[PDB]
Design a binder for this molecule. Sequence first.
Ligand SMILES: [Fe+2]
Length: 187
Amino acid sequence: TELLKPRTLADLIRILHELFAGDEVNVEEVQAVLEAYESNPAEWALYAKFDQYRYTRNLVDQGNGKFNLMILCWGEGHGSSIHDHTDSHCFLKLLQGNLKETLFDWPDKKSNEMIKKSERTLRENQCAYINDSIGLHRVENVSHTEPAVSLHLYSPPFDTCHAFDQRTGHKNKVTMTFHSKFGIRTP
Ligand SMILES: [Fe+2]
């Protein structure tokens, strides 16, 4: 063990490599380390590539295959589907701005409105955690004036998930794409 405060994004990545050296994941330790990194915009500007129309996913590190670390850039009003995480751990840390997270239960096979179980505002530097056992969520930048930037870690990596129709609970498979990888736009 001996978790130390990451001094920089680079230092955080190094620490994460250590924490994912094995086949299991200490969720509380990973969350603690992510939370302890104090966002420094100069360190992640390279990855903070926005799109006018929707949020972008910008790959930072491939975690020697154990995890993907990426930065998501949310324009004003940009948000996600209600989605799962494909049997992976998902950590979400705010680097800039605020995001609203809404939780949903897994739908029953009957077609019904998905009612929100709860919501919270994730603030700068806070780190949230979700997995399929916890439930489903939507993440949204509700701000009209401030873009948000978040750092996401998923283990194992996954590039598909399901989006859920809020009116019915019906799910559709979605393939996730990257806007950039290692600072390089990937069209
Ligand atoms: Fe998510």
